[PDB]
Design a protein. Sequence first.
Lengths: 480, 40, 378, 48, 86
Amino acid sequence: PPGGGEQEPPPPPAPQDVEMKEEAATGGGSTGEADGKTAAAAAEHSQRELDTVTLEDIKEHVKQLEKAVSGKEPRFVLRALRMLPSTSRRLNHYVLYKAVQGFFTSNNATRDFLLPFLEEPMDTEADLQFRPRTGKAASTPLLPEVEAYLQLLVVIFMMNSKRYKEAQKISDDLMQKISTQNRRALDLVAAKCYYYHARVYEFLDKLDVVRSFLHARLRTATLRHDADGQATLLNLLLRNYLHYSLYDQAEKLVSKSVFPEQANNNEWARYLYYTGRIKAIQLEYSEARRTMTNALRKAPQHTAVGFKQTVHKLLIVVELLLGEIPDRLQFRQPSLKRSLMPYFLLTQAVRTGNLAKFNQVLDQFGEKFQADGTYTLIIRLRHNVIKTGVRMISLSYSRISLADIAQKLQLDSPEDAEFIVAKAIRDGVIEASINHEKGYVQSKEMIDIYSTREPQLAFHQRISFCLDIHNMSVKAMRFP
Amino acid sequence: MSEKKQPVDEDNWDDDNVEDDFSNQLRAELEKHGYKMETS
Amino acid sequence: PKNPDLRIAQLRFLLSLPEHRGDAAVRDELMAAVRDNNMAPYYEALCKSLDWQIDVDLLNKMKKANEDELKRLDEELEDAEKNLGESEIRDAMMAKAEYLCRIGDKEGALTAFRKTYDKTVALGHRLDIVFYLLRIGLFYMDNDLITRNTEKAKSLIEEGGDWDRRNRLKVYQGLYCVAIRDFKQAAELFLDTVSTFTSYELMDYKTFVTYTVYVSMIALERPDLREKVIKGAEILEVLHSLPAVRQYLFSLYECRYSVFFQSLAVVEQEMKKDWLFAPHYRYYVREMRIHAYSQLLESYRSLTLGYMAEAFGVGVEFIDQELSRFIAAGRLHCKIDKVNEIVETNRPDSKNWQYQETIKKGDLLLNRVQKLSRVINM
Amino acid sequence: LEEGKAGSGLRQYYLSKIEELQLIVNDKSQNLRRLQAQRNELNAKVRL
Amino acid sequence: EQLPESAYMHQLLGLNLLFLLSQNRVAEFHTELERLPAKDIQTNVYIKHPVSLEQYLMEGSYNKVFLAKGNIPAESYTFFIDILLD
């Protein structure tokens, strides 16, 4: 007891130091940043908030544990008050209550008592200015607390957060409206909480009404104030409207627009993966392979760990339907390895045309595919592999006989081979002529693609791609 | 990233890309290509 | 002080793939147990080979005499440190006590490596460390310890020159280049040849000639393949002593494909029965084929495979799927006509496809600076 | 007011949005004004 | 989503499914099965016939379809298999 008793006091000062100065330096700093300039936004503290919340989402959040009473949530949410420069006294009173945890017997004011606490910035009379700071006070205590996931009676407090922070949404739409620049700072905060909206419902029931409530904030951001706001709302749509039926696939046509400009960076990179799985159910491979490839190369920085790895797993799924794929272990990660083992040997059976090997993969490894929901392709991927097998042979040989390729690709009969080659010509896969007597297939080398034709015509898209980046560099140069 | 539902749900490894093409095709192979000597 | 125990690692792979002889490999292993005071070499071989009967007191009076020889070196640490001298006191507790790693397990290894590491004022003693890390990583297949010590060996000992132990490093990484997959630097670091001469860590130099000649038939191109052997002085006499290797070397330049499938199997026999070549022989097979098939299809624009049946003796359906599985993997792109008995050459890589490396590698390049351009600012 | 002081702010927001947009375009001009005066001084350097 | 089980629900999901296969549209074919997509291959043999029927159209069939046209529950598919002919 004396050994562990003396080690209890030291830690809580650590949240009283860094976690204090988290919203003391940033929040007190963003005060003057959100009072003016306010260009854009920027307000880089809102992006610095991405380097805090996501950092806090591991440690320490607000709590924790660490060996405190979880009294940081009531501390900053009380006594806002605020006014002219005496707001420093509020930060000074935040230092005064630090000794309360270390001296007296500490008491936990979270949970049940957090209901009037979120009303206090309104009850302090008055805020009087920044809702994003109170939105932060209605989120950063509660939303990182959602990671506990105890599911008992505190989920309605997570809903009470989504209630009183919807009262912040009431102050979001009603207040300002003219050169706000807090909404663009809130578009990062409103995004997150709307993400936590979707997350909290997934543990109880998927949201039917919030789907209607999503289009509310969706449509109302147009055209008055929209920067990055509708994109994050469109991400909420395509995320869940994918996993749940129906008709949401073709919905992307009337929504886009794009919506420009893509923000922020990797945030829009995953969006191409979302519509990527969509366009995969449209059966169009070519537009799906370019949006999936662009989804990996445009996505920084990780780690950790498998969040980027699992999304990359199902990303190369469109490559299984392309018909041209290499062995995917070049994309393997030691952490993703154990999870991709049932999905690994799959593509290894795609490179071969054996039915007994391909069907054995579906039987044993089909259990892993149930969680992915990828069973739509397994019926049409049989027709994809037979195109890869015939392309391997047709590219390796000038002439290929139907009887020799019959059992080599084990089509087993001459009649269905005439049906496959016919549809292969219909799809433009093979140029082979066929001489029908028994019959047999006699092809010839295809040429004249040459030099003067394809490379210089493709270079029209290459330079038009490059000369636009010259403007992209100038536009990016004009901001500094 | 880590937002949205991302978190919700030489070496021999480099040669293993090509090495697995040996597993499903033509083994390595010595014995079979060594048996083809006296076949014809 | 390696080859007697370095051959126990040869005995491990001799036990590993073939199961035929368990007595012949355990007799010289026990003969290596009754000398050199080997303990774990026969303990890890006790699971692979037979579990006797009894070793025990026969080899326990050894590990006791080892312990007597171990304690007298452990008595030498406080007896010599009673006096004072530079590096001389604690130099006796490295080479012979890391020779006790040769006795057994890693206990001699790990505790005698770092214990003597801080004192040594000479780079030769620090490399004897790296030496004994390379043998234990050869004995036990673990690849970790032999990668790191060589990295420590290149920084300190190369400062700086040496003739003797530095040429061994080029052999070690060259042996590591053939341990993992590197063709080009394997024979490149093996260019030293007789300058290393023969050493306990170089085993039999004639076998080192076999290691460098098998990588030199791929990585060393045909103009340079005949050059290094014919123009190279010291390397030419050792290959002429072996009629099997020298034949296949000149027959490769002679282009006859009738003796290849025979002689290449003889090389594959050595490639099958040698350690560290087990993962690497699979791609080695058809890489020497395309090496012989490179010059093959370059000869004629239209070639009949019946004329290939002559040289192959007789390829009919064998090269049908063989050469087809070469094209699918991107090796030697060519067009071979089926049932028409015609091979077409091609592919004119001097113009069209050779341009594609510009933009393709330049796509992800410029894409990487597109995304990272939107980061600045924000 | 209802026309109004709630709507006019949104009207004033458009101008302030364009003012910040213009300031962004101005910030693109301001640093570009330096590239002129620099080379304009360099145009005096060849005359120097 | 909680509703009592019905009877005719089975084949009518297939009636519009096979009628839409007769008009050659591939897109709306699989999206109609998205009501229970995970259980398509797992259960509901009434859904298993069209997904195996489309498999034979890629063979093509012709032959295998008419052999499977010998035994069908169906039910009511008789009108649509005549348009599947044309």
